[PDB]
């Protein structure tokens, strides 16, 4: 249908991975999706791979598990042959190089011999790239084949495992066993060969180095060896700084979560500037830990660049000095220098290898423990209606037996009832028949199919139709009858989508009663012979249970001639059921029918009784720091190329009398240039890392100001999760990732340019081969960077359903084995694992594709460089050819970094633009103009007047308020009342200028507020919200976050508020640590705290929103009693629902529509027979 092209591709195609080239070029043109993705190979599929492991595990287990990993041994054994060949081919370049340098020096030689070496060099290097990436393919395949197998085995085991063994581990730990431990065996499969390969590679590297120079070459090996423990110590110190940074980050995010949630109250109080300073105080504590991390990193990039110099200097300095007769030739100097770069890789990768093999041995032990658990005995219950003979059941393999001496038989097509007190083993009885408990003695058998309904209902996250169907073919007539009979139609109609929706696990939440009603229906629809109902009756009402019991479970219901054993706490439905079974602490006390069992008077009777974005980042770091870093960078790369060119002159000088003439003079200058290089490496490393902290500080302070200057409309239209993700994800990218990447990218780019400059400086004919190879490099990079990111994205989104599915399986183990649908859920899991590998297999081949193309362009640069030297022998000297070829031989490595760090850059720079997202968005009015600033005239009277005022909720919508004209004198207590969805709430938003006046004017004390600054208005008037939220921190801070006025003022305010009793003589008097939106304090306390805030400011115009909405009628009286005496001469404009508060005022205004319908005195409007009289009647109190 859509097979993998690998199997139907030629030999040459498979060697060079040409068969994926089709999928790469396609991936640039259009986006790659899950459908545009090949079928797996037959030998990679779960149903082929998994059964071979579980077979060998069953075989090996019998004899009594690295012995079981001789399943993937045969395929992986081929790996050793390719890798062994690669290690010997690796030490061909330096051996051939020595001959080529001798050739150029030996003038009187046959010329053709040159061309032979340069040919033999290219061929040798090109067989190396092919054999290498064959070795890596069969390693990455064998690792992929282990992941598929391990996941498979773990899943099968999780079904057959016993309750005792499952209670040992957590649901998390078993899901982590499939997610972490199995994932590590993909990785282990790769680098496990380096345990034998790297030491063999080191041993050879040392020996070739020894023949080339002498015992002097130890001095070089010493340095590189001493860098390994320095790398270890510094890599430990960064991890402790990373954890210190991460702990400080969560404090900032937790505070932002409160600000983003509770902006609505924060804006009304004018606490934007106060909480801006509060976040910045935490941010500076976080930027000091990054500043310590910056100095460290600088030393990290310092040691990397100056190592290949320090080694070279130390080795030559020792060699040259110890004896004057030691002559330094080009054939000695550049071959040893090349060998040192071959020797450098294994020592560095050896600490990572050994580190990872240790962690794999932790994961290997965890699997061995889980796989070698005791499974349930399947032939404990016969499966030839239900009969038991002296059965005894434990929960654990050895434990006090739960059920002891039970002997009961149930006729076919009868209703049985299990009753008793809590902890009588009535819950365990149904678990025993399903073969979950371990049998000790006795005979048990159940006839035909079995349907189960657990106490704690399990509901897998799928379509609610397909949940009740549970993998059965639909029958519309019957499906309608059971859904009706279960009384699920009243619940079905309420749900947003209706018939087909999502589950509370990950979607719309269902109540305890609804969960049972689905779970009951799921069993009913299946239509099995025997039914085991483990207390379905946990519904909202008995009236619901009456409908269900009679229509489904009872003799008049669906299951008329079907065996149905039930266990229940209810005593209501007993006289309907045929026979009742009473238990006593894990033993059947007495069996009998309702009529006869009461007559005996037994236990039963007692039971009933974009370049733009890069320039934005450039302006963020600062232009002085930017230019200084670029200057110090070019100073390093120049100082590097000159030192390597100076080495190539030191080689070329005659031997006068078995001595190299001037050598100490040259050795010094060579030493000096290295210090000049090393100093500038630490320079741009520190300069860039310092710059990253300046941008981090700027972009955070810029973003945090932009958010707070926004209107509340922004916070309604924008999702809260979108804003929280910004501060969390995108800042962390700018802080850590971007500064480290830009120095690795630039470092790589100028090492590639640097290598080309030497090749051109050596051979000017090199020019002609630069545009052809550059054009190839551009196109192979163009397709990879595009296509690769799509495949990695598809892999990361296709791995999440595998863990999501296994977590659901682990919860509903009892149900899956009751209905006996394991085979279904196996195929369900095999399908999901395959869909993950279908994404992962192209992803890994994409890497092999690029690597063969890049290394082929690498081998072309070393070919042409070495060839043009032979074409111009008689011009050049032995030193220039050494330097030219030795550089070109390192190009391949830089091209890999240049392509990677190009892709890493393009993803990370997106985050910079998204931190400046809300820069040009609509901002509210200026916080203070402080030109026409209000004086102390506002409180003198407190006049309020609306002049034909009107507002809209949305920008383009019908008017909410309209024709609002009324005058309020100073000291008057005014009431505002209406019906639901009138717009009385909107008048509070207008008074505080949350939404700017859509049409008309609003005046306070002969001074128009529409022109005046927001914060000057916001302070001068106070508000009591509906649900006053408390911000986490001090209670002293919660009352006054500025802390301007005295502490006695805070006490005398809490004294008048009558909250004196609370936090009176607690050790936390004033500085009590509140948290979680004021969870510590109760509902009533919150109203008194916000009243105290108003009693501290003592403003002459107050407003109350839902003051008497779901109050305990204790703080309700305290609110009203304080309002009377404290705010006696002060104006108040109250928004209330209940009439009791509204009735006790001088003036009241009534509006149902957008217009003011009625206004006057409460006593006057009752006599006038207005809308107030109608409202008062409808309320109840007249």
């Amino acid at each position: 249908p859509n097979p993998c092209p690998e199997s139907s591709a030629s030999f040459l195609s498979r060697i060079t991975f040409w068969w994926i080239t089709g999928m790469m070029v396609q991936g640039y043109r259009q986006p790659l999706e899950s459908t545009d993705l090949w079928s797996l190979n037959k030998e990679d599929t779960s149903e082929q791979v998994v059964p071979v492991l579980v077979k060998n595990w069953k075989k090996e287990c019998a004899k009594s598990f690295k012995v079981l990993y001789k399943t993937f041994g045969p395929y992986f054994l081929m790996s050793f042959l390719f890798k062994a060949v690669h290690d010997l081919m690796m030490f061909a370049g330096p051996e051939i190089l020595k001959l080529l340098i001798n050739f150029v020096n030996d003038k009187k030689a046959p010329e053709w011999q040159g061309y032979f070496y340069t040919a033999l060099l290219f061929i040798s290097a090109c067989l190396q790239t092919l054999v290498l990436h064959q070795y890596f393919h069969i390693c990455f395949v064998s690792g992929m084949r282990i992941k598929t197998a391990v996941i498979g085995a773990v899943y099968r085991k999780a079904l057959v495992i016993t309750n005792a063994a499952r209670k040992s581990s957590t649901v998390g730990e078993i899901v982590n066993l499939m997610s972490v431990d199995a994932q590590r065996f993909m990785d282990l499969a790769t680098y496990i060969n380096m345990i034998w390969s790297a030491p063999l590679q080191v041993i050879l590297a040392l020996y070739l180095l020894w023949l080339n120079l002498g015992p002097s070459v130890l001095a070089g090996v010493a340095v590189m060896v001493l860098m390994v423990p320095l790398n270890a110590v510094m890599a430990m110190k960064t991890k402790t700084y990373q954890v210190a940074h991460m702990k400080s980050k969560d404090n900032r995010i937790k505070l932002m979560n409160e600000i983003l949630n509770g902006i609505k109250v924060l804006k009304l109080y004018a606490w934007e500037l106060a909480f801006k300073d509060k976040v910045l105080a935490i941010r500076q504590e976080e930027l000091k830990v990054l500043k310590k991390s910056a100095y460290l990193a600088a030393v990290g990039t310092f040691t990397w660049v100056c190592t290949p110099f320090l080694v070279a200097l130390s080795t030559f300095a020792v060699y040259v000095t110890v004896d004057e007769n030691n002559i330094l030739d080009a054939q000695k100097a550049f071959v040893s220098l090349a060998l040192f770069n071959i020797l450098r890789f294994p020592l560095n990768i050896l600490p990572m290898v050994i580190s990872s093999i240790v962690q794999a041995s932790v994961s290997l032990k965890r699997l061995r423990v889980f796989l070698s658990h005791e499974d349930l005995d399947p032939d404990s219950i016969q499966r030839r209606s239900i009969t038991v003979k002296n059965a005894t059941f434990t929960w654990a393999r050895n434990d006090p037996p739960t059920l002891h001496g039970i002997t009961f038989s149930v006729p076919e097509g009868s209703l049985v009832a299990v009753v008793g007190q809590v902890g009588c083993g009535k819950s365990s009885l149904l678990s025993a028949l399903l073969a979950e408990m371990d049998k000790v003695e006795g005979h048990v058998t159940v006839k035909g199919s079995v349907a189960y309904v657990p106490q704690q209902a399990w509901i897998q996250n799928i379509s609610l139709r397909e949940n009740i169907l549970f993998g059965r073919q639909l029958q519309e007539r019957y499906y309608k009858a059971v859904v009706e009979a279960c009384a699920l139609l009243p619940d079905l109609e309420i749900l947003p989508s209706g018939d087909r929706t999502e589950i509370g696990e990950k979607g719309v939440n269902l109540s305890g009663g609804q969960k049972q009603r689905v779970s009951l229906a799921r069993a009913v629809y299946c239509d099995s012979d025997v039914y085991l109902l483990d207390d379905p009756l946990s519904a909202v009402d008995a009236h619901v249970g009456k409908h269900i019991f009679e229509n489904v479970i009872g003799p008049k219901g669906l299951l008329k001639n079907k065996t149905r054993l039930l266990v229940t706490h209810a005593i209501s439905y007993l006289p309907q059921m045929d026979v009742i079974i009473v238990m006593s602490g894990g033993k059947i006390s007495e069996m009998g029918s309702y009529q006869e069992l009461l007559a005996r008077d037994g236990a039963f009777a007692e039971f009933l009784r974009k370049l733009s974005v890069y320039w934005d980042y450039m302006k963020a770091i600062g232009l002085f720091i930017s230019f200084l870093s670029i200057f110090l960078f070019l100073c390093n790369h120049v100082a590097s190329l000159v030192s390597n060119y100076w080495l190539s002159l030191w080689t070329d000088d005659p031997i006068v009398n078995g001595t190299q003439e001037h050598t100490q003079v040259r050795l010094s200058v060579y030493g000096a240039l290295g210090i000049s290089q090393g100093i500038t490496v630490f320079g741009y490393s520190m300069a860039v890392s310092i710059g990253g902290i300046f941008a981090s500080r700027r972009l955070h302070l810029d973003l945090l100001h932009n958010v707070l200057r926004s209107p509340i409309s922004f916070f309604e239209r924008t999702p809260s999760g979108n804003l929280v993700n910004r501060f969390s994800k995108e800042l962390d990218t700018v802080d850590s990732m971007i500064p480290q990447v830009i120095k690795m990218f630039m470092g790589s780019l100028f090492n590639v340019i640097g290598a080309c400059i030497i090749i051109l400086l050596a051979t000017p004919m090199a020019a002609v081969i630069i545009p052809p190879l550059g054009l190839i490099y551009f196109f192979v990079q163009r397709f990879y960077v595009a296509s690769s990111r799509q495949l990695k994205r598809l892999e990361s989104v296709s791995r999440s359903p595998v863990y999501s599915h296994f977590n659901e399986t682990l919860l509903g183990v009892s149900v899956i084995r009751a209905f006996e649908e394991q085979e279904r859920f196996i195929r369900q899991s095999d399908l999901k694992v395959d869909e993950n590998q279908k994404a992962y297999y192209p992803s890994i081949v994409a890497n092999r594709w690029l690597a063969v193309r890049l290394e082929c362009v690498g081998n072309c640069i070393v070919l042409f460089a070495s060839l043009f030297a032979v074409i111009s022998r008689h011009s050049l000297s032995a030193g220039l050819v050494g330097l030219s070829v030795s550089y070109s031989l390192q190009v391949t490595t830089y091209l890999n970094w240049l392509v990677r760090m190009s892709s890493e850059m393009e993803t990370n720079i997106v985050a910079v633009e998204r931190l400046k997202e809300y820069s040009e968005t609509e901002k509210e009015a200026p916080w203070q103009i402080q030109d026409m600033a209000p004086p102390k005239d506002w409180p003198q009277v407190g006049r309020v007047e609306f002049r034909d005022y009107g507002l809209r909720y949305r920008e383009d919508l019908d008017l909410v308020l309209k024709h609002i004209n009324v005058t309020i004198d100073g000291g008057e207590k005014v009431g505002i009342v209406g019906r639901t969805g009138a717009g009385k709430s909107s008048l509070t938003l207008g008074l505080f200028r949350i939404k700017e006046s859509a049409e008309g004017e609003i005046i306070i004390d002969d001074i128009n507020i529409a022109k005046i600054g927001l914060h000057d208005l916001r302070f001068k008037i106070t508000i009591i919200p509906q649900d006053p939220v408390l911000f986490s921190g001090s209670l002293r801070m919660n009352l006054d976050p500025f802390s301007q006025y005295s502490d006695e003022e805070v006490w005398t305010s809490l004294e008048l508020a009558h909250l004196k009793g609370f936090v009176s003589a607690l050790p936390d008097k004033l500085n009590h640590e509140c948290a979680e939106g004021g969870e510590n304090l109760s509902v009533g306390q919150r109203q008194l705290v916000c009243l105290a805030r108003a009693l501290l400011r003592k403003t002459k115009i107050l407003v109350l929103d839902e003051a008497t909405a779901a109050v305990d009628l204790e703080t309700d009286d305290l609110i009203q009693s304080t309002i009377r005496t404290q705010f006696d001469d002060c104006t108040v404009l109250t928004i209330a629902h209940r009439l009791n508060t509204i009735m006790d005022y001088t003036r009241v205004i009534v509006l149902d529509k957008g217009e003011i319908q009625e206004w006057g005195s409460p006593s006057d409007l009752l006599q006038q027979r207005g809308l107030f009289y109608s409202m008062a009647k409808d309320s109840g109190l007249v």
């Binding site: 680098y191 040691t303 990872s356 470092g747 890497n847």
Partner: peptide, 17 residues
Amino acid sequence: XFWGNLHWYYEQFDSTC
């Protein structure tokens, strides 16, 4: 993505390089 290592690793040392 290691400390003082701009060595190219074709290996996946526990991925998340």
